[PDB]
Write a protein that binds this ligand. Structure first.
Ligand SMILES: CO[C@@H]1O[C@H](CS[C@@H]2O[C@H](CO)[C@@H](O)[C@H](O)[C@H]2O)[C@@H](O)[C@H](O)[C@H]1O
Length: 606
Protein backbone atom coordinates (compact mmCIF):
# COMPACT_ATOMS: atom_id res chain seq x y z
CA UNK A 1 0.00 0.00 0.00
CA UNK A 2 3.04 2.07 -0.86
CA UNK A 3 6.08 2.24 1.37
CA UNK A 4 5.68 -1.73 1.69
CA UNK A 5 5.95 -1.40 5.48
CA UNK A 6 2.58 0.39 5.42
CA UNK A 7 0.49 0.18 8.58
CA UNK A 8 -2.99 1.65 8.31
CA UNK A 9 -3.36 2.81 11.96
CA UNK A 10 -0.18 4.87 11.50
CA UNK A 11 -1.56 6.72 8.47
CA UNK A 12 -2.80 10.18 9.58
CA UNK A 13 -4.98 10.57 6.49
CA UNK A 14 -7.22 7.62 7.36
CA UNK A 15 -10.57 7.98 9.16
CA UNK A 16 -10.43 7.49 12.94
CA UNK A 17 -12.75 4.45 12.97
CA UNK A 18 -10.54 2.60 10.46
CA UNK A 19 -7.41 3.46 12.37
CA UNK A 20 -9.04 2.20 15.59
CA UNK A 21 -10.20 -1.09 14.00
CA UNK A 22 -6.87 -1.62 12.28
CA UNK A 23 -4.94 -1.16 15.55
CA UNK A 24 -7.36 -3.15 17.75
CA UNK A 25 -7.14 -6.19 15.46
CA UNK A 26 -3.36 -6.31 15.97
CA UNK A 27 -3.27 -6.13 19.76
CA UNK A 28 -2.49 -8.90 22.27
CA UNK A 29 -4.56 -9.27 25.42
CA UNK A 30 -1.68 -7.68 27.37
CA UNK A 31 -1.59 -4.68 24.98
CA UNK A 32 -5.37 -4.30 25.34
CA UNK A 33 -5.42 -4.45 29.14
CA UNK A 34 -2.47 -2.07 29.11
CA UNK A 35 -4.51 0.60 27.28
CA UNK A 36 -7.16 0.26 30.00
CA UNK A 37 -4.63 0.92 32.74
CA UNK A 38 -3.86 4.41 34.08
CA UNK A 39 -1.06 4.80 36.61
CA UNK A 40 0.39 7.57 38.77
CA UNK A 41 3.59 9.17 37.62
CA UNK A 42 4.78 8.29 41.16
CA UNK A 43 4.92 4.58 40.23
CA UNK A 44 5.87 4.94 36.57
CA UNK A 45 9.29 4.12 35.08
CA UNK A 46 10.25 3.47 31.48
CA UNK A 47 10.29 -0.29 32.01
CA UNK A 48 6.90 -0.36 33.70
CA UNK A 49 5.36 1.67 30.88
CA UNK A 50 6.95 -0.48 28.16
CA UNK A 51 6.56 -3.93 29.73
CA UNK A 52 2.90 -3.38 30.68
CA UNK A 53 1.91 -1.47 27.55
CA UNK A 54 0.48 1.28 29.78
CA UNK A 55 -2.32 3.41 28.28
CA UNK A 56 -2.27 6.47 30.49
CA UNK A 57 -0.60 8.30 33.31
CA UNK A 58 -1.83 10.93 35.70
CA UNK A 59 -0.66 13.44 38.18
CA UNK A 60 -3.08 13.35 41.10
CA UNK A 61 -3.36 16.41 43.37
CA UNK A 62 0.11 17.62 44.25
CA UNK A 63 1.93 14.98 42.12
CA UNK A 64 4.62 17.13 40.59
CA UNK A 65 8.17 16.47 39.34
CA UNK A 66 9.32 18.94 41.95
CA UNK A 67 8.35 22.10 43.80
CA UNK A 68 8.63 25.13 41.57
CA UNK A 69 9.09 23.04 38.41
CA UNK A 70 9.20 25.07 35.14
CA UNK A 71 6.91 24.37 32.15
CA UNK A 72 9.91 22.76 30.38
CA UNK A 73 10.56 20.42 33.37
CA UNK A 74 6.94 19.23 33.05
CA UNK A 75 7.34 18.78 29.28
CA UNK A 76 10.55 16.75 29.80
CA UNK A 77 8.84 14.54 32.36
CA UNK A 78 5.84 13.85 30.14
CA UNK A 79 8.08 13.31 27.06
CA UNK A 80 10.32 10.84 29.00
CA UNK A 81 7.25 8.79 29.76
CA UNK A 82 5.97 9.13 26.21
CA UNK A 83 9.30 7.89 24.77
CA UNK A 84 8.96 4.68 26.71
CA UNK A 85 5.37 4.17 25.45
CA UNK A 86 6.33 4.94 21.83
CA UNK A 87 9.05 2.26 22.03
CA UNK A 88 6.53 -0.61 22.50
CA UNK A 89 5.84 -2.96 19.57
CA UNK A 90 2.75 -0.99 18.47
CA UNK A 91 3.99 2.46 19.65
CA UNK A 92 0.64 3.53 21.10
CA UNK A 93 1.20 6.90 22.75
CA UNK A 94 0.05 7.39 26.31
CA UNK A 95 -2.38 10.11 27.33
CA UNK A 96 -1.39 12.10 30.42
CA UNK A 97 -4.14 13.48 32.67
CA UNK A 98 -4.23 16.09 35.46
CA UNK A 99 -6.75 18.07 37.50
CA UNK A 100 -6.66 21.42 35.73
CA UNK A 101 -9.89 22.52 37.37
CA UNK A 102 -9.28 26.27 37.82
CA UNK A 103 -6.34 26.76 35.56
CA UNK A 104 -3.42 24.30 35.39
CA UNK A 105 -3.49 24.45 39.17
CA UNK A 106 -0.86 21.92 40.29
CA UNK A 107 1.79 23.91 38.40
CA UNK A 108 3.92 26.71 39.84
CA UNK A 109 3.29 29.92 37.94
CA UNK A 110 0.08 28.73 36.25
CA UNK A 111 -2.77 31.20 36.09
CA UNK A 112 -5.29 30.35 38.84
CA UNK A 113 -8.86 31.14 37.90
CA UNK A 114 -11.75 31.48 40.28
CA UNK A 115 -13.28 28.20 41.39
CA UNK A 116 -16.52 27.05 39.83
CA UNK A 117 -18.94 28.45 42.43
CA UNK A 118 -17.63 31.95 41.65
CA UNK A 119 -17.85 31.25 37.93
CA UNK A 120 -21.51 30.35 38.42
CA UNK A 121 -21.99 33.80 40.02
CA UNK A 122 -20.86 35.42 36.74
CA UNK A 123 -23.74 33.90 34.74
CA UNK A 124 -21.31 34.31 31.80
CA UNK A 125 -20.88 31.08 29.82
CA UNK A 126 -18.67 32.74 27.20
CA UNK A 127 -16.27 33.85 29.94
CA UNK A 128 -16.08 30.20 31.10
CA UNK A 129 -15.49 29.07 27.52
CA UNK A 130 -12.58 31.51 27.32
CA UNK A 131 -11.27 30.18 30.64
CA UNK A 132 -11.38 26.69 29.04
CA UNK A 133 -9.33 27.96 26.08
CA UNK A 134 -6.71 29.57 28.29
CA UNK A 135 -6.60 26.53 30.61
CA UNK A 136 -5.97 24.20 27.67
CA UNK A 137 -3.05 26.34 26.53
CA UNK A 138 -1.51 26.30 30.01
CA UNK A 139 -2.02 22.54 30.28
CA UNK A 140 -0.33 22.05 26.87
CA UNK A 141 2.50 24.38 28.07
CA UNK A 142 3.38 21.52 30.49
CA UNK A 143 3.05 18.85 27.81
CA UNK A 144 -0.18 17.44 29.23
CA UNK A 145 -3.05 16.50 26.88
CA UNK A 146 -5.96 15.70 29.22
CA UNK A 147 -7.77 17.65 31.94
CA UNK A 148 -10.08 16.06 34.50
CA UNK A 149 -12.64 18.86 34.09
CA UNK A 150 -15.35 20.08 34.22
CA UNK A 151 -16.83 18.99 37.46
CA UNK A 152 -20.54 19.28 36.61
CA UNK A 153 -21.78 18.28 40.05
CA UNK A 154 -24.94 20.12 41.09
CA UNK A 155 -24.11 20.66 44.75
CA UNK A 156 -27.36 20.40 46.76
CA UNK A 157 -25.82 20.89 50.23
CA UNK A 158 -23.01 23.35 50.97
CA UNK A 159 -21.67 21.16 53.79
CA UNK A 160 -20.03 19.16 51.02
CA UNK A 161 -16.26 19.77 51.00
CA UNK A 162 -16.33 20.02 47.19
CA UNK A 163 -19.25 22.45 46.87
CA UNK A 164 -16.84 25.10 45.40
CA UNK A 165 -16.27 22.78 42.42
CA UNK A 166 -19.96 23.07 41.52
CA UNK A 167 -21.06 26.04 39.45
CA UNK A 168 -24.48 26.03 41.15
CA UNK A 169 -27.24 24.29 43.10
CA UNK A 170 -29.35 25.08 39.98
CA UNK A 171 -28.71 22.56 37.20
CA UNK A 172 -29.61 25.15 34.56
CA UNK A 173 -26.59 27.21 35.57
CA UNK A 174 -24.38 24.08 35.55
CA UNK A 175 -25.73 23.18 32.09
CA UNK A 176 -24.91 26.66 30.81
CA UNK A 177 -21.34 26.34 32.22
CA UNK A 178 -20.64 23.20 30.15
CA UNK A 179 -19.23 25.76 27.66
CA UNK A 180 -15.98 25.04 29.49
CA UNK A 181 -15.84 21.90 27.34
CA UNK A 182 -15.58 23.43 23.85
CA UNK A 183 -13.11 25.93 25.39
CA UNK A 184 -10.85 23.10 26.52
CA UNK A 185 -11.36 20.89 23.47
CA UNK A 186 -12.39 23.18 20.61
CA UNK A 187 -15.81 23.76 19.05
CA UNK A 188 -17.25 20.64 17.50
CA UNK A 189 -17.78 20.53 13.67
CA UNK A 190 -21.14 21.69 12.20
CA UNK A 191 -22.24 18.14 11.41
CA UNK A 192 -21.48 16.73 14.87
CA UNK A 193 -23.14 13.64 16.41
CA UNK A 194 -23.94 14.07 20.15
CA UNK A 195 -21.87 11.71 22.28
CA UNK A 196 -18.92 11.46 19.89
CA UNK A 197 -15.59 12.52 21.50
CA UNK A 198 -13.85 15.57 20.09
CA UNK A 199 -10.57 17.42 20.48
CA UNK A 200 -9.50 19.89 17.75
CA UNK A 201 -5.74 19.26 17.93
CA UNK A 202 -2.47 19.93 19.75
CA UNK A 203 -3.42 23.28 21.25
CA UNK A 204 -6.48 21.71 22.91
CA UNK A 205 -6.98 19.00 25.56
CA UNK A 206 -9.37 16.13 26.14
CA UNK A 207 -11.94 17.09 28.80
CA UNK A 208 -13.72 14.99 31.39
CA UNK A 209 -17.27 15.48 32.69
CA UNK A 210 -17.25 14.38 36.31
CA UNK A 211 -18.30 12.76 38.53
CA UNK A 212 -21.03 10.56 37.01
CA UNK A 213 -23.61 10.85 38.51
CA UNK A 214 -25.19 12.61 41.51
CA UNK A 215 -21.93 13.50 43.25
CA UNK A 216 -23.53 16.73 44.39
CA UNK A 217 -26.55 15.02 46.04
CA UNK A 218 -24.90 13.04 48.85
CA UNK A 219 -26.84 12.98 52.18
CA UNK A 220 -25.54 15.71 54.60
CA UNK A 221 -23.15 16.61 51.75
CA UNK A 222 -20.98 13.67 52.93
CA UNK A 223 -18.28 13.14 50.26
CA UNK A 224 -18.34 9.71 48.52
CA UNK A 225 -21.60 8.81 50.32
CA UNK A 226 -25.18 7.97 49.27
CA UNK A 227 -27.33 10.08 46.95
CA UNK A 228 -30.90 9.13 48.00
CA UNK A 229 -33.30 10.47 45.39
CA UNK A 230 -35.72 8.89 42.91
CA UNK A 231 -34.93 8.42 39.22
CA UNK A 232 -36.89 11.61 38.52
CA UNK A 233 -34.69 13.80 40.79
CA UNK A 234 -31.58 12.10 39.37
CA UNK A 235 -32.74 12.81 35.85
CA UNK A 236 -34.06 16.29 36.62
CA UNK A 237 -31.22 17.66 38.79
CA UNK A 238 -28.04 15.61 38.46
CA UNK A 239 -28.14 14.20 34.91
CA UNK A 240 -29.04 17.05 32.50
CA UNK A 241 -25.58 18.65 32.22
CA UNK A 242 -24.18 15.26 31.08
CA UNK A 243 -26.47 15.51 28.01
CA UNK A 244 -25.12 19.04 27.27
CA UNK A 245 -21.64 17.53 27.68
CA UNK A 246 -22.52 14.87 25.04
CA UNK A 247 -23.72 17.55 22.63
CA UNK A 248 -20.40 19.34 23.06
CA UNK A 249 -18.31 16.25 22.39
CA UNK A 250 -16.81 15.70 25.87
CA UNK A 251 -14.06 13.09 25.35
CA UNK A 252 -14.28 11.27 28.67
CA UNK A 253 -16.51 10.82 31.72
CA UNK A 254 -15.21 9.99 35.19
CA UNK A 255 -17.38 7.89 37.49
CA UNK A 256 -18.29 9.05 41.01
CA UNK A 257 -17.19 7.44 44.29
CA UNK A 258 -20.81 7.95 45.36
CA UNK A 259 -23.74 5.58 45.23
CA UNK A 260 -27.23 6.16 43.90
CA UNK A 261 -29.77 4.58 46.25
CA UNK A 262 -27.16 2.23 47.72
CA UNK A 263 -25.71 1.05 44.35
CA UNK A 264 -22.07 2.05 43.86
CA UNK A 265 -21.66 4.09 40.67
CA UNK A 266 -18.47 2.17 39.86
CA UNK A 267 -20.54 -1.01 39.73
CA UNK A 268 -23.68 0.45 38.11
CA UNK A 269 -24.17 -1.25 34.76
CA UNK A 270 -27.65 0.28 34.24
CA UNK A 271 -26.35 3.87 34.49
CA UNK A 272 -22.89 3.49 32.93
CA UNK A 273 -23.70 1.12 30.05
CA UNK A 274 -27.50 1.29 29.99
CA UNK A 275 -27.84 5.04 30.18
CA UNK A 276 -24.51 6.83 29.50
CA UNK A 277 -23.40 4.57 26.67
CA UNK A 278 -26.59 3.05 25.19
CA UNK A 279 -29.05 5.94 25.76
CA UNK A 280 -26.91 9.11 25.60
CA UNK A 281 -24.78 7.35 22.94
CA UNK A 282 -21.50 8.33 24.64
CA UNK A 283 -18.64 7.07 22.41
CA UNK A 284 -15.68 8.45 24.37
CA UNK A 285 -14.08 6.58 27.26
CA UNK A 286 -15.34 6.14 30.76
CA UNK A 287 -12.67 6.42 33.44
CA UNK A 288 -12.80 5.43 37.12
CA UNK A 289 -12.07 7.76 39.95
CA UNK A 290 -8.87 7.33 42.00
CA UNK A 291 -9.07 3.82 43.50
CA UNK A 292 -12.76 4.11 42.74
CA UNK A 293 -13.11 0.39 42.03
CA UNK A 294 -11.40 -0.47 45.38
CA UNK A 295 -14.19 1.41 47.12
CA UNK A 296 -16.93 -0.72 45.65
CA UNK A 297 -16.33 -3.06 48.64
CA UNK A 298 -16.16 -2.18 52.34
CA UNK A 299 -13.58 -2.10 53.53
CA UNK A 300 -12.17 -0.65 50.31
CA UNK A 301 -9.74 -2.97 48.60
CA UNK A 302 -10.94 -6.05 50.51
CA UNK A 303 -11.84 -7.99 47.34
CA UNK A 304 -9.99 -6.40 44.49
CA UNK A 305 -10.86 -9.31 42.22
CA UNK A 306 -14.54 -8.44 42.65
CA UNK A 307 -13.73 -4.73 42.17
CA UNK A 308 -12.23 -5.41 38.71
CA UNK A 309 -15.01 -7.76 37.65
CA UNK A 310 -17.86 -5.47 38.75
CA UNK A 311 -16.36 -2.25 37.36
CA UNK A 312 -15.34 -3.63 33.99
CA UNK A 313 -18.65 -5.45 33.52
CA UNK A 314 -20.51 -2.25 34.54
CA UNK A 315 -18.87 -0.65 31.51
CA UNK A 316 -15.83 1.35 32.70
CA UNK A 317 -13.11 1.56 30.07
CA UNK A 318 -10.04 2.96 31.79
CA UNK A 319 -9.12 2.34 35.40
CA UNK A 320 -7.29 4.97 37.47
CA UNK A 321 -5.61 2.24 39.43
CA UNK A 322 -3.35 4.25 40.02
CA UNK A 323 -0.62 2.53 42.05
CA UNK A 324 -1.12 -1.23 42.18
CA UNK A 325 -1.02 -1.70 38.38
CA UNK A 326 0.52 -5.19 38.65
CA UNK A 327 -2.40 -6.53 40.68
CA UNK A 328 -4.95 -4.80 38.39
CA UNK A 329 -3.38 -6.19 35.22
CA UNK A 330 -2.92 -9.74 36.60
CA UNK A 331 -6.48 -9.89 37.90
CA UNK A 332 -8.11 -8.55 34.74
CA UNK A 333 -5.97 -10.89 32.63
CA UNK A 334 -7.19 -13.82 34.84
CA UNK A 335 -10.82 -12.81 34.39
CA UNK A 336 -10.51 -12.63 30.61
CA UNK A 337 -8.60 -15.94 30.47
CA UNK A 338 -11.33 -17.66 32.57
CA UNK A 339 -14.23 -16.23 30.52
CA UNK A 340 -15.56 -14.10 33.38
CA UNK A 341 -15.10 -10.91 31.30
CA UNK A 342 -15.66 -11.39 27.61
CA UNK A 343 -13.28 -10.17 24.94
CA UNK A 344 -16.10 -8.04 23.53
CA UNK A 345 -16.03 -5.92 26.73
CA UNK A 346 -12.24 -5.53 26.57
CA UNK A 347 -12.47 -4.59 22.86
CA UNK A 348 -15.22 -2.02 23.56
CA UNK A 349 -13.02 -0.37 26.25
CA UNK A 350 -9.96 -0.28 24.04
CA UNK A 351 -11.99 0.91 21.05
CA UNK A 352 -13.15 3.93 23.08
CA UNK A 353 -9.68 4.75 24.48
CA UNK A 354 -8.16 4.52 21.01
CA UNK A 355 -11.00 6.56 19.47
CA UNK A 356 -10.20 9.42 21.86
CA UNK A 357 -6.46 9.21 21.22
CA UNK A 358 -6.77 9.12 17.42
CA UNK A 359 -9.46 11.82 17.29
CA UNK A 360 -7.40 14.21 19.38
CA UNK A 361 -4.30 13.87 17.18
CA UNK A 362 -2.22 12.03 19.80
CA UNK A 363 -0.60 9.59 17.30
CA UNK A 364 0.47 12.59 15.16
CA UNK A 365 1.64 14.76 18.07
CA UNK A 366 2.63 12.52 20.96
CA UNK A 367 5.31 14.84 22.30
CA UNK A 368 5.21 18.31 23.85
CA UNK A 369 5.63 21.50 21.91
CA UNK A 370 8.42 23.52 23.51
CA UNK A 371 7.06 26.72 21.92
CA UNK A 372 4.01 26.36 24.19
CA UNK A 373 5.99 26.68 27.47
CA UNK A 374 5.44 30.42 27.62
CA UNK A 375 1.65 30.02 27.63
CA UNK A 376 2.06 29.10 31.33
CA UNK A 377 0.98 32.07 33.46
CA UNK A 378 0.78 34.21 30.35
CA UNK A 379 -0.36 37.76 31.07
CA UNK A 380 -3.40 37.71 28.82
CA UNK A 381 -4.61 34.66 30.79
CA UNK A 382 -4.05 36.54 34.02
CA UNK A 383 -6.07 39.46 32.63
CA UNK A 384 -8.89 36.95 31.84
CA UNK A 385 -8.66 35.55 35.39
CA UNK A 386 -8.82 39.10 36.78
CA UNK A 387 -11.99 39.75 34.71
CA UNK A 388 -13.47 36.49 35.98
CA UNK A 389 -12.64 37.20 39.63
CA UNK A 390 -14.30 40.60 39.38
CA UNK A 391 -17.43 39.24 37.70
CA UNK A 392 -17.67 36.50 40.37
CA UNK A 393 -17.99 38.93 43.31
CA UNK A 394 -21.44 39.21 44.83
CA UNK A 395 -22.15 42.41 46.74
CA UNK A 396 -24.35 41.40 49.67
CA UNK A 397 -24.48 44.71 51.54
CA UNK A 398 -23.45 48.28 50.72
CA UNK A 399 -24.56 50.59 53.58
CA UNK A 400 -25.90 49.77 57.07
CA UNK A 401 -29.18 51.62 56.56
CA UNK A 402 -31.14 52.70 53.52
CA UNK A 403 -30.17 56.33 54.08
CA UNK A 404 -26.39 55.78 54.49
CA UNK A 405 -23.98 56.85 51.78
CA UNK A 406 -22.97 53.70 49.89
CA UNK A 407 -19.44 52.72 50.97
CA UNK A 408 -18.58 51.10 47.61
CA UNK A 409 -17.04 52.14 45.39
CA UNK A 410 -14.19 53.45 47.50
CA UNK A 411 -12.01 56.41 46.47
CA UNK A 412 -8.48 55.56 45.31
CA UNK A 413 -7.24 58.84 46.83
CA UNK A 414 -7.42 59.16 50.63
CA UNK A 415 -4.82 60.20 53.16
CA UNK A 416 -4.53 56.80 54.85
CA UNK A 417 -6.34 53.47 54.58
CA UNK A 418 -6.24 50.13 56.42
CA UNK A 419 -6.08 46.68 54.90
CA UNK A 420 -6.59 43.93 57.43
CA UNK A 421 -7.51 40.33 58.03
CA UNK A 422 -6.08 36.84 57.71
CA UNK A 423 -7.09 36.73 54.00
CA UNK A 424 -5.82 40.17 52.89
CA UNK A 425 -2.26 39.03 52.12
CA UNK A 426 -2.40 35.28 51.64
CA UNK A 427 -2.35 33.97 48.07
CA UNK A 428 -2.94 30.36 49.11
CA UNK A 429 -6.09 31.31 51.00
CA UNK A 430 -7.52 33.31 48.10
CA UNK A 431 -6.91 30.28 45.75
CA UNK A 432 -8.34 27.59 48.06
CA UNK A 433 -8.18 23.85 47.38
CA UNK A 434 -6.63 22.26 44.33
CA UNK A 435 -3.85 24.85 44.14
CA UNK A 436 -0.26 23.55 44.14
CA UNK A 437 -1.27 20.94 46.69
CA UNK A 438 -4.37 18.84 46.59
CA UNK A 439 -5.80 20.59 49.63
CA UNK A 440 -4.32 23.99 48.78
CA UNK A 441 -1.97 25.66 51.26
CA UNK A 442 -1.13 28.92 53.05
CA UNK A 443 1.02 31.82 51.92
CA UNK A 444 2.82 32.60 48.72
CA UNK A 445 2.60 29.25 46.95
CA UNK A 446 2.64 30.48 43.34
CA UNK A 447 2.74 33.68 41.26
CA UNK A 448 -0.18 36.04 41.92
CA UNK A 449 -1.44 39.21 43.55
CA UNK A 450 -2.93 39.23 47.00
CA UNK A 451 -5.69 41.67 48.01
CA UNK A 452 -3.11 43.83 49.82
CA UNK A 453 -0.86 43.96 46.75
CA UNK A 454 -3.88 44.77 44.57
CA UNK A 455 -4.88 47.66 46.83
CA UNK A 456 -1.37 49.11 46.71
CA UNK A 457 -1.34 48.72 42.91
CA UNK A 458 -4.65 50.51 42.57
CA UNK A 459 -4.53 53.51 44.84
CA UNK A 460 -3.35 57.03 44.17
CA UNK A 461 0.32 57.48 45.03
CA UNK A 462 -0.60 59.94 47.87
CA UNK A 463 -2.67 57.21 49.55
CA UNK A 464 -0.86 55.65 52.53
CA UNK A 465 -1.78 51.97 52.80
CA UNK A 466 -1.31 50.31 56.21
CA UNK A 467 -1.48 46.53 56.63
CA UNK A 468 -2.38 44.87 59.92
CA UNK A 469 -3.46 41.26 59.96
CA UNK A 470 -5.39 41.30 63.20
CA UNK A 471 -5.46 44.81 64.59
CA UNK A 472 -7.21 45.68 67.80
CA UNK A 473 -9.92 48.26 68.15
CA UNK A 474 -7.62 50.86 69.61
CA UNK A 475 -5.08 50.59 66.77
CA UNK A 476 -7.93 51.19 64.32
CA UNK A 477 -9.46 54.20 66.18
CA UNK A 478 -6.02 55.83 66.60
CA UNK A 479 -4.88 55.27 63.00
CA UNK A 480 -6.58 58.15 61.19
CA UNK A 481 -7.91 55.82 58.51
CA UNK A 482 -10.43 56.92 55.90
CA UNK A 483 -11.75 53.40 55.58
CA UNK A 484 -10.70 49.80 55.88
CA UNK A 485 -10.82 46.73 53.61
CA UNK A 486 -10.88 43.56 55.71
CA UNK A 487 -10.57 40.09 54.21
CA UNK A 488 -11.38 36.94 56.12
CA UNK A 489 -12.91 33.54 55.56
CA UNK A 490 -12.32 29.82 55.06
CA UNK A 491 -8.99 28.01 54.91
CA UNK A 492 -8.23 25.85 51.86
CA UNK A 493 -9.85 22.41 51.80
CA UNK A 494 -11.16 19.58 49.65
CA UNK A 495 -13.53 16.61 49.87
CA UNK A 496 -13.54 15.09 53.29
CA UNK A 497 -11.66 17.74 55.29
CA UNK A 498 -14.07 20.36 53.88
CA UNK A 499 -17.10 18.26 54.84
CA UNK A 500 -18.18 20.65 57.55
CA UNK A 501 -21.41 20.66 59.55
CA UNK A 502 -21.15 24.08 61.20
CA UNK A 503 -19.98 26.32 58.30
CA UNK A 504 -18.67 29.09 60.53
CA UNK A 505 -15.47 30.81 59.52
CA UNK A 506 -12.37 30.25 61.72
CA UNK A 507 -11.40 32.89 64.23
CA UNK A 508 -9.85 35.40 64.27
CA UNK A 509 -12.13 36.39 61.45
CA UNK A 510 -15.27 37.78 62.96
CA UNK A 511 -13.32 39.38 65.85
CA UNK A 512 -11.02 41.25 63.40
CA UNK A 513 -14.00 42.46 61.35
CA UNK A 514 -15.66 43.68 64.57
CA UNK A 515 -12.52 45.47 65.76
CA UNK A 516 -11.97 47.12 62.41
CA UNK A 517 -15.57 48.03 61.58
CA UNK A 518 -16.08 49.29 65.13
CA UNK A 519 -13.41 51.95 64.46
CA UNK A 520 -13.80 52.97 60.83
CA UNK A 521 -16.20 52.41 57.91
CA UNK A 522 -15.24 48.97 56.48
CA UNK A 523 -15.64 46.83 53.38
CA UNK A 524 -15.52 43.12 54.32
CA UNK A 525 -14.31 40.73 51.70
CA UNK A 526 -15.43 37.18 52.52
CA UNK A 527 -13.27 34.42 50.93
CA UNK A 528 -15.11 31.09 50.96
CA UNK A 529 -15.96 28.02 48.90
CA UNK A 530 -19.61 28.35 49.78
CA UNK A 531 -22.12 30.26 51.89
CA UNK A 532 -21.08 30.35 55.52
CA UNK A 533 -22.78 31.75 58.64
CA UNK A 534 -22.73 35.42 57.75
CA UNK A 535 -25.18 37.40 59.97
CA UNK A 536 -22.55 38.47 62.49
CA UNK A 537 -20.22 39.60 59.66
CA UNK A 538 -23.10 41.47 58.06
CA UNK A 539 -24.05 43.17 61.33
CA UNK A 540 -20.55 44.56 61.82
CA UNK A 541 -19.89 45.58 58.20
CA UNK A 542 -20.79 48.70 56.18
CA UNK A 543 -20.27 46.66 53.00
CA UNK A 544 -19.69 42.97 52.44
CA UNK A 545 -18.60 41.10 49.34
CA UNK A 546 -18.75 37.34 48.79
CA UNK A 547 -15.60 36.84 46.71
CA UNK A 548 -15.68 33.02 46.77
CA UNK A 549 -12.21 31.63 45.92
CA UNK A 550 -11.08 34.13 43.34
CA UNK A 551 -7.71 32.69 42.37
CA UNK A 552 -4.31 34.20 41.70
CA UNK A 553 -5.45 37.59 40.38
CA UNK A 554 -6.54 39.59 43.43
CA UNK A 555 -6.76 42.74 41.35
CA UNK A 556 -10.14 41.40 40.31
CA UNK A 557 -11.32 42.20 43.82
CA UNK A 558 -10.02 45.74 43.83
CA UNK A 559 -11.36 46.40 40.32
CA UNK A 560 -14.82 46.28 41.88
CA UNK A 561 -13.96 47.82 45.30
CA UNK A 562 -12.54 50.96 43.71
CA UNK A 563 -15.21 51.32 41.01
CA UNK A 564 -13.30 50.58 37.79
CA UNK A 565 -16.15 48.18 37.10
CA UNK A 566 -19.57 47.77 38.67
CA UNK A 567 -20.53 44.75 40.80
CA UNK A 568 -22.57 42.39 38.63
CA UNK A 569 -22.28 38.93 40.27
CA UNK A 570 -25.38 37.06 41.49
CA UNK A 571 -25.57 34.28 44.05
CA UNK A 572 -25.36 30.91 42.31
CA UNK A 573 -26.46 29.23 45.54
CA UNK A 574 -28.93 29.82 48.31
CA UNK A 575 -27.52 31.63 51.33
CA UNK A 576 -28.98 29.92 54.40
CA UNK A 577 -29.96 31.57 57.69
CA UNK A 578 -28.85 28.53 59.61
CA UNK A 579 -27.18 25.17 58.91
CA UNK A 580 -30.22 23.57 60.66
CA UNK A 581 -32.17 24.48 57.53
CA UNK A 582 -29.95 22.38 55.22
CA UNK A 583 -30.44 21.00 52.71
CA UNK A 584 -32.42 23.93 51.35
CA UNK A 585 -32.42 24.73 47.63
CA UNK A 586 -34.21 27.18 45.36
CA UNK A 587 -37.60 25.63 44.61
CA UNK A 588 -37.94 23.65 47.84
CA UNK A 589 -41.32 23.81 49.54
CA UNK A 590 -39.93 25.26 52.77
CA UNK A 591 -37.57 27.87 51.33
CA UNK A 592 -36.52 30.50 53.86
CA UNK A 593 -33.18 31.95 52.68
CA UNK A 594 -31.07 34.76 54.17
CA UNK A 595 -30.40 35.60 50.50
CA UNK A 596 -32.19 33.81 47.66
CA UNK A 597 -30.40 32.32 44.71
CA UNK A 598 -29.93 35.15 42.18
CA UNK A 599 -29.47 37.88 44.81
CA UNK A 600 -26.78 40.50 44.33
CA UNK A 601 -26.49 44.23 44.75
CA UNK A 602 -24.98 46.37 42.01
CA UNK A 603 -22.76 49.34 41.72
CA UNK A 604 -21.89 51.63 38.76
CA UNK A 605 -18.30 52.15 37.63
CA UNK A 606 -16.84 55.57 38.77
C1 LIG B 1 -6.32 11.35 49.34
O1 LIG B 1 -5.72 10.98 48.10
C2 LIG B 1 -5.69 12.01 47.13
O2 LIG B 1 -6.99 12.14 46.55
C3 LIG B 1 -7.05 13.11 45.50
C4 LIG B 1 -8.53 13.28 45.13
S1 LIG B 1 -9.31 11.72 44.76
C5 LIG B 1 -9.83 11.87 43.05
O3 LIG B 1 -8.63 12.11 42.31
C6 LIG B 1 -8.88 12.33 40.89
C7 LIG B 1 -7.54 12.42 40.15
O4 LIG B 1 -6.66 13.38 40.79
C8 LIG B 1 -9.72 13.60 40.68
O5 LIG B 1 -9.96 13.87 39.29
C9 LIG B 1 -11.07 13.40 41.34
O6 LIG B 1 -11.92 14.55 41.16
C10 LIG B 1 -10.88 12.99 42.81
O7 LIG B 1 -12.17 12.61 43.26
C11 LIG B 1 -6.10 12.72 44.37
O8 LIG B 1 -6.02 13.71 43.33
C12 LIG B 1 -4.68 12.52 44.91
O9 LIG B 1 -3.88 11.97 43.87
C13 LIG B 1 -4.69 11.56 46.08
O10 LIG B 1 -3.38 11.46 46.65
Amino acid sequence: HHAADYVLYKDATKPVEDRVADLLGRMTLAEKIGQMTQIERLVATPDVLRDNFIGSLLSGGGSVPRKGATAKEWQDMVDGFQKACMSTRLGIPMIYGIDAVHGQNNVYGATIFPHNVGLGATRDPYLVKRIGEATALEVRATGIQYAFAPCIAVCRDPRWGRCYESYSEDRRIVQSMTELIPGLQGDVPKDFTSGMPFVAGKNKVAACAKHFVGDGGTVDGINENNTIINREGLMNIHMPAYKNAMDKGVSTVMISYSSWNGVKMHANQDLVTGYLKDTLKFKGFVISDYEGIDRITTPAGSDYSYSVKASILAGLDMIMVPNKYQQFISILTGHVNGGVIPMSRIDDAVTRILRVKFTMGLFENPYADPAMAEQLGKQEHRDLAREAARKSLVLLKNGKTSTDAPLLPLPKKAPKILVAGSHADNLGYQCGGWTIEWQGDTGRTTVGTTILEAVKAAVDPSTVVVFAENPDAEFVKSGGFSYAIVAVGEHPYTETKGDNLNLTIPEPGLSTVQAVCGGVRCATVLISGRPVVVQPLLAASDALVAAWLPGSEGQGVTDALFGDFGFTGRLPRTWFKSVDQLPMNVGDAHYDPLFRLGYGLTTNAT
